[PDB]
RNA sequence: AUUAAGACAUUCGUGAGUGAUUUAUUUCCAUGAAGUGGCGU
């Protein structure tokens, strides 16, 4: 019966019929322009293996890639009026840590495993999961 | 039938023990039980 299942989508349903804003993770080079090998036979890299031509990442806006200010992996993106709308991961999801026990009242039970910690996530109000 | 299912942050636990509303302080200071005699030169 089931033939095709689309990847799970993050959909923002705000108000009215309007439209569904499909949210995607930010590509790992959002505002970074990578400038690969200027072919001059020199300055290669060994990626645990064979030749690879020395990526050069610039802030696409010069300096170089500073990894102390790299946060494209904490962002989610959606279609805009010719610019990318960036939403932080912690705004989409809310995290909760739950303490759980077994009251164990009785008389002779061994209190040996009566404690656990559970992480529960909550999607923001105007956010739904969807797939085809 | 899906890295699922199942599980009270619960059991025990006195806001309690010690502790003078006590110490210091004159109901005292001033003050006359006193004044006058009267009647017929």
- The distance (Å) linking the CA of A44 with the C1' of B3 is 41
Pairwise CA distance, residues A90 & A123, whole Å: 10
Closest nucleotide (C1' vs CA) to A116 is B7
Cα–Cα nearest to A61, from A73, A52, A69? A69
Nucleotides on strand B with an atom closer than 7 A to protein CB?
A: 6-11
Structure tokens belonging to residue A129: 């999961």
The whole-angstrom distance between residue A44's C-alpha and the CA centroid of its chain comes to: 31
Closest nucleotide (C1' vs CA) to A104 is B10
- Rg of chain A in Å (alpha carbons): 24
Q: A51 pairs with which residues across the strands?
A: A46
- The distance (Å) linking the CA of A74 with the C1' of B11 is 43
Closest nucleotide (C1' vs CA) to A98 is B9
* Percentage helix, strand, coil for chain A under 3-state DSSP, each rounded to 5: 10, 35, 55
- The distance (Å) linking the CA of A84 with the C1' of B25 is 89
Is residue A116 classed exposed, middle or buried when 0-12, 13-18 and 19+ CB atoms within 10 A define those classes?
A: exposed
- CA end-to-end distance (rounded Å), chain A: 14
Q: A52 pairs with which residues across the strands?
A: A45
């Amino acid at each position: 019966v089931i033939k095709q299942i689309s990847p799970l989508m993050l959909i923002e349903c705000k108000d009215d019929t309007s439209s569904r804003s499909i949210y995607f993770p930010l590509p790992l080079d959002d505002g970074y322009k990578v400038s690969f090998n200027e072919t001059s036979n020199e300055d290669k890299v060994f990626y645990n293996g064979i030749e690879c031509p020395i990526p050069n990442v610039y802030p696409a806006s010069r300096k170089f890639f500073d990894h102390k200010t790299y946060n494209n992996y904490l962002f989610w993106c959606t279609q805009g009026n010719n610019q990318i709308k960036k939403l932080l991961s912690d705004e989409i999801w809310i995290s909760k840590m739950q303490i759980g026990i077994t009251k164990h009242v009785e008389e002779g039970e061994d209190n040996d495993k009566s404690f656990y910690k559970q992480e529960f996530l909550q999607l923001k109000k105007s956010f739904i999961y969807a797939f085809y």
